[PDB]
Amino acid sequence: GRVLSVGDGIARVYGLKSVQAGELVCFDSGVKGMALNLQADHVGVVVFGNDSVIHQGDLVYRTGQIVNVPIGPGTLGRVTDGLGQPIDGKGPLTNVRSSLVEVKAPGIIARQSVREPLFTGVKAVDALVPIGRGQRELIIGDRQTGKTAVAIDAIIHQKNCNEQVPKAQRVYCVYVAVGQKRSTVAQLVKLFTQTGAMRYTIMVSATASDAAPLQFLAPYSGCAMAEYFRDTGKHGLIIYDDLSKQSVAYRQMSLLLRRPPGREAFPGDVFYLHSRLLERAAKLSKELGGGSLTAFPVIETQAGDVSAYIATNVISITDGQIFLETELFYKGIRPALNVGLSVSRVGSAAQFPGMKQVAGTLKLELAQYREVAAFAQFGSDLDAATQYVLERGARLTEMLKQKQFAPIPIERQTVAVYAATKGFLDKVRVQDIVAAEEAVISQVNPAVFKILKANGKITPALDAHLKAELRKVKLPGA
């Protein structure tokens, strides 16, 4: 094929008459392409790289193949670009196999219900908005909330669980970094190395200097690298960091392929852009292996405005929602989870049974905390039980705070919400409930955490032993 015109990362190509839609093509400059809109007179080819090396009249060869990435266990540990190619300087991907990036999601008969829990290690999530394996959960928030920090804590925590579970139920994580800085993702490879999570992590990095078709296609490349573990009976965890930056990369190609703009400028098919991708996160049936893929799309809002175009699409696609608020972030509540707006549609089906019976009371009390504090900040009057619910809900709000990169396993999370909901953290001052609960985990016997890990549930022979052990602790303030 001959290049008719070229500019802005689009090359209109004469000829190429047998080219397929979505097929990889190769320019004679070595830079690749993808035939996106086949027209009667030309082909519209989005260019995988810098379009300064393409000239008018250059030769375009079709590769014959739709766009594909190398999948397999040889991608584990490596940092690749938007299509497979590793950018960490460690040679080729050994022990790997190519497969298409646009695979049809498993249908109705290929699934089963989401029942196993996915522990993130964030107790504001693992108590109130719990996440099952095969569930897609939106981490939506404003500009610099804790959105990545929720998702990095879900990845680091899988390293802590993979050492303790058998080989079959290990979760292999994939972090797709779309439109970010290249040094921002270099800070995450350094964090995943010195924690050790890079043994189980693939990083698909389409940074801000990559071409707009490399950032549009990198969530699909990362989903294809993570669908390897779903299709072969293992468990995957995919995190698409800023799907709101993938859709801006999609809007750029759609406006330069002269597809007519819609809302804000976005193409019409931008719902189909994300629902094609998030529906690939599934819990498969046991005939297909019982494998699983859990998605965490990240969407950035502008001023807490979830009524945007891309925001309302992904809210409509995903099961749950982890809504992070910038005003809760600065009040000290970090993770800044809006407990009144954050949902989980799987809900009590796939949470920890040891915390299903504790965090039912926790959201029942925090729902009562919210409306009474709207009244009592005026300073009218207080009622000695209305005084109880805004004093108890302050014990629970400080309980769900957390530090940056320390995911709490699942048993030390449910003992702490036990000690906060069974009254053991009343008359402890509110300033050091964040400081009392290290004593509630360290001074309480380390072998009571093993029973609640092995049972998975507070047995009657354990609450009478644990609440005997939550009394022999030296709490600060008191």
Binding site: Q302, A303, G304, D305, S307
Partner: peptide, 15 residues
């Protein structure tokens, strides 16, 4: 974000 302002006008007018 255009309906946050209309309900804030609602709140201020009822106050």
């Amino acid at each position: 974000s255009n309906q946050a302002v209309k309900q804030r006008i609602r709140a201020i007018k009822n106050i």
